[PDB]
Design a protein around this ligand. Structure first.
Ligand code: NAI
Ligand code: NAI
Ligand code: NAI
Ligand code: 9TY
Ligand code: 9TY
Ligand code: 9TY
Ligand code: 9TY
Ligand code: MG
Ligand code: MG
Ligand code: MG
Ligand code: MG
Ligand code: MG
Ligand code: MG
Ligand code: MG
Ligand code: MG
Lengths: 328, 328, 328, 328
């Protein structure tokens, strides 16, 4: 199938590589690659992270100076401002090149056209799904992790083998796997989650609390303990990742199984409608517009919501409680 | 009636004129006027068009330098960015004047207040309805073409005679006609079309294709031939422009006449509702806001839609076919 | 694929052919075929067209006399009355034959069962999509045109090779193409257009006019100029036929592109519903019934609608105007 | 105003006139005109009416023979079959003429295009509103009556003076009046009544009966007496025609006035909607189609409804009663 379990490491040996950033990924992938036998460099904003980067023994010039030396570049930096940075400090230099290759972590800014490099650069993606620390929590085990790969532009007939070259350049396969996928799919996915089941879950919890308290005379403490103040959810998620989502439930009681299944098959249509709406909203590019404007206005809504959430009853009760249990 | 079939040419003889741009209109109208016995100049961004302009024998200074010399100016340039250009490079100079006159092709930026020149300048419009090449395709015939005229500000009691002076300064009347109309009407009209019957037409065609294929076992080729791959529509539009929209249908079969008329009178209310909605959306200024913001965000939606349209089935089939017929 | 770019001319050489009519197609296809090296004849109502036909040097007997001599027949005549004519003057003669072949331009009368020849005749279709004059406008260029082919009944195991034989007998391939398709598809298509996007377009235009005038108090002249009195639509249709429907819009302004695309994707569902309704109405045979009855009653509705359309405001204004521009 | 109170009698003196029919109008208008000093003739189906016509001293040839002799013709015959009769026995003869004039009582068959005489005949209407006997009930009083006039085609520049000539040729003005009006208006009106307030009235009466009987234990006799078996309605209608519709109610009780007015203003919208629907149904020509087909099928619905109405309870009770009162 489309999967790839291992590949070559040929095109990247003999060239220099441009690593932009020393954050979570940047540091991890960069240390990995240096340890994989390649000549690499770093570009970074000269701050605490730069201290740490030069600390770990990576020569770090300015951004553009790392792009002039390298024939490849990895932009391991945020999604919200990368645009301007590319416009000012990277586009000129890049125009000062002929054969180049650029790879990202996320496809947001590219899939939606906020960044359109020239046709003189093969354009690709390599994206994992962790938060980042798990990857050292796997590398010290000699394992490998799974990732997504994409190609946006090929001016060399070699974008894909460069893709797998990079892949093995970061220690994913062999040991994990590597999926090939457009930029579009990656963004669509990373957003659907952030828009569909996470917020639904949180709202459902909040509603259960509010109801139980204001309509059946219950104590906040008990509600919090039942719903999320206990690590129940964590164990469930672990068992899911290990055994399977459904096979997991065998370790539960029959009553739980019955209720869960019935209600699941009973509410599947509603959430389906919701998911359709949101995925459509995304495929078109509307959310990108919304978010970019919200940046351009001063993050007001962001602010007010961050306020309301914390000033809710549930949060205050959680505060009193976590204090009681010593949890910070 | 409000029409005007010919007028004078007095106020423009003895003055200099400022022509901003050498594109489609700029070149045509400018060559026309030079050939109409006037002293004119050109302002242009120094690029290929500037090469062509100085090629055809028009002294072309910088924009502001053409405004300092001229007592009139014609801004024959786009609608999406003209704002900034006026703010930086034209407003100062114009402030360095007392009696001036400015005329545009479109009323978008003025009707909605994105450009507010001083009360020391008579403000007007002169707009034709072609794409531009038809106008030489008429001038070499010695004909004249129809246009729209408007006045936004009059500080001379002469805005209108300047209007008709310009009109005859471009070779429209005598030979065509000249309508007088606010900036607002022009914009309203140029937008209603672009929002109402064009997109409806395209969507209807697309839907006919999709249906015929996916629900009655038809070949893409036949559908494309029937609907638009044939030049039927072109001949129909020509006959419309020549004889009249309805009188045109006499050259059709009775069956076609019957079905067309019945269905037309059957669906008139729906589209009427739609048109009402859109015209209202415009009269208020909302669309201008939408579009300006979409510029300020990075044209994401534009991008995604341009993608989806081309990646549709109909387009791919059209590709294979046009290839077969040799059509580029 | 199903297409055919060229084929043989064997079965038609050595036989006589029956051409019924000398109208648009009849004359064109007949002259073409005579010029393609075949023995042909004509049948016609003895009137002006008969004068013109015998003028151009085609021996023209009575209809039935041309069917007795020919082993093939092409019924190149209307769709509304052909029934009776076949019942009286053609069915008897045809019954006086054993091996025969009949081909039409349109599949209306056959697809719906208004004409059911015997099982002793291979039944087929050959239909182009022009209005007819374009085909000489292509033949004098030595080109070829596209057409649709169908087979309703085969009593010879040769209906298809007869089909392609005829095809090349009229000068379509090589130079154009030839699609194979049931009678049903042809009728369905020729009707969907006449019921879906043509009338919608006209109604939308009419509504735009009415609104702009009676709501914003604009001048009729300007509205007419913007919407259809200008040949804008013609150039657009030409560019469509040449480049492609979407690629066409590159020659427009970004504003137009944006509005058009958004609104297109915004109204696709409505027109889809409409098209579904009408196509269903057709597939069943209801429209044929409606139309046949309307013939049998005296064309009242036809009359009243032809009246209302012309007595509308838009038409009167168009009259005054076209008069002004010299357009007949 | 548009009214006409008297006019000339010039164009009809010196010519012959063609009177088709000797029914209600035919006899009345014909006798009137003969008595008005003109040379006239009659055409009639040779039956009892022909006996009566030749009885009263009118030479009566065959239809076509009366059209060959006359330069004018009046078609004073029904609306349901006149079509065929004109097609067979009148159109040929008429084609055997150059300057002719044709006038009707009703505009049904013309307004809807079921009859389209040549452009060599001025086409007009003259229609009264009685049932016909009232007109002698006025002529023996030396009065005059009101009528409607229309012109469909004028090939003489004299259609209107011929109109008024005819008008005075039948004894309407002076003494009554004469309104000018298209064929369309006449048909629209004569139908609206027959579709809107007559049937509504009858249905309301029927419903009142049914309700009163089946839901409040009332005797049929009393209901019939109250609603219509009494001549109340007749006196009311007379007073309406004499004094005015509203001024009429002064002769009623205050209670009646109050209830009537309140309920009238309370139900005006509903019936308005209904009337709109029906008038629209007519303006388009649909009803003509419906009726013509119902003729072509065998008058089934007509039959079944004529049955149901008479086999209703109300009718049987009316039978028993009218028998009791001696009313036939
Ligand atoms: N746990 C996470 O946050 C993960 C992030 N990603 C994606 O990877 C990229 C970010 O990953 P990380 O950098 O490791 O996490 P991070 O959010 O801590 O990024 C910090 C890095 O961004 C650079 N940076 C920040 N502001 C800058 C500025 N104004 N100018 C120049 N450089 C600036 C800094 O060099 C810094 O090292 C994004 O594309 C993100 O969508 C994907 C998987 C998980
Ligand atoms: N076919 C069409 O596009 C027609 C356009 N109009 C209107 O006329 C005006 C445009 O007419 P055209 O110039 O002939 O079409 P265009 O799209 O070819 O405009 C090109 C001209 O714009 C100037 N220009 C472009 N970018 C510039 C920049 N950054 N800075 C300075 N100058 C720049 C250039 O001098 C160039 O000559 C607009 O108001 C438009 O709405 C009206 C009728 C038809
Ligand atoms: N140009 C068009 O309108 C198109 C029409 N078609 C189809 O082709 C056929 C008609 O094409 P054309 O004849 O070229 O156009 P047409 O509509 O001008 O047909 C005129 C021909 O019909 C014959 N005709 C008319 N009335 C007759 C009668 N009472 N009795 C005997 N013959 C009579 C005449 O011989 C005359 O030559 C139809 O099936 C039509 O649906 C297909 C493509 C384009
Ligand atoms: O909510 C609980 O604690 C569970 C139960 O079955 O009682 C395990 C699911
Ligand atoms: O769609 C067609 O080709 C037309 C027909 O009447 O068949 C001309 C309209
Ligand atoms: O962009 C514009 O202004 C167009 C017009 O309506 O004239 C070409 C589409
Ligand atoms: O129905 C009646 O008899 C009337 C009354 O007022 O009682 C005259 C109207
Ligand atoms: Mg994310
Ligand atoms: Mg994620
Ligand atoms: Mg526009
Ligand atoms: Mg326009
Ligand atoms: Mg057709
Ligand atoms: Mg067609
Ligand atoms: Mg009547
Ligand atoms: Mg009446």
């Amino acid at each position: 199938d489309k999967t790839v379990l291992d590949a070559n490491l040929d095109p990247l040996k003999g060239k220099t590589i441009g690593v932009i950033g020393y954050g979570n990924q940047g540091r991890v992938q960069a240390t990995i690659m240096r340890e994989n036998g390649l000549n690499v460099i770093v570009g970074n904003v000269k701050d605490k992270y730069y201290e740490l980067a030069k600390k770990e023994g990576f020569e770090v010039y300015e951004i553009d100076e790392a792009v002039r030396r390298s024939d490849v570049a990895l932009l391991l930096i945020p999604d919200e401002v990368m645009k301007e940075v590319y416009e000012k400090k990277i586009a000129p230099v890049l125009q000062g090149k002929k054969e180049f290759v650029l790879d990202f972590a996320s496809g947001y800014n590219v899939a939606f056209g906020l960044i359109r490099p020239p046709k003189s650069v093969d354009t690709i993606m390599v994206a994992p799904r962790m938060v980042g620390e798990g990857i050292m929590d796997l590398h010290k085990q000699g394992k490998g992790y799974p990732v997504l790969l994409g190609v946006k532009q090929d001016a060399s007939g070699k974008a894909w083998d460069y893709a797998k070259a990079i892949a093995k350049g970061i220690g994913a396969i062999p040991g994990g796997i590597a999926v090939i996928s457009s930029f579009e799919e990656e963004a669509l996915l990373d957003l659907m989650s952030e828009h569909t089941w996470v917020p639904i879950l949180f709202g459902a919890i909040k509603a259960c609390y509010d109801i139980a308290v204001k309509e059946y005379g219950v104590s906040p403490e008990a509600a919090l303990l039942e719903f999320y103040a206990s690590g129940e959810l964590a164990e469930i998620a672990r068992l899911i990742a290990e055994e399977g989502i459904f096979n997991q439930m065998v370790h539960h009681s029959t009553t739980s199984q019955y209720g869960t299944l019935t209600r699941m098959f009973k509410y599947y249509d509603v959430v389906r409608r919701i998911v359709e709406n949101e995925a459509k909203y995304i495929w078109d590019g509307s959310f990108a517009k919304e978010w970019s404007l919200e940046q351009q206005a001063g993050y007001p809504v962001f602010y007010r919501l961050w306020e309301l959430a914390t000033q809710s009853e549930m949060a205050k009760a959680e505060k009193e409680l976590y204090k009681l249990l010593g949890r910070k």
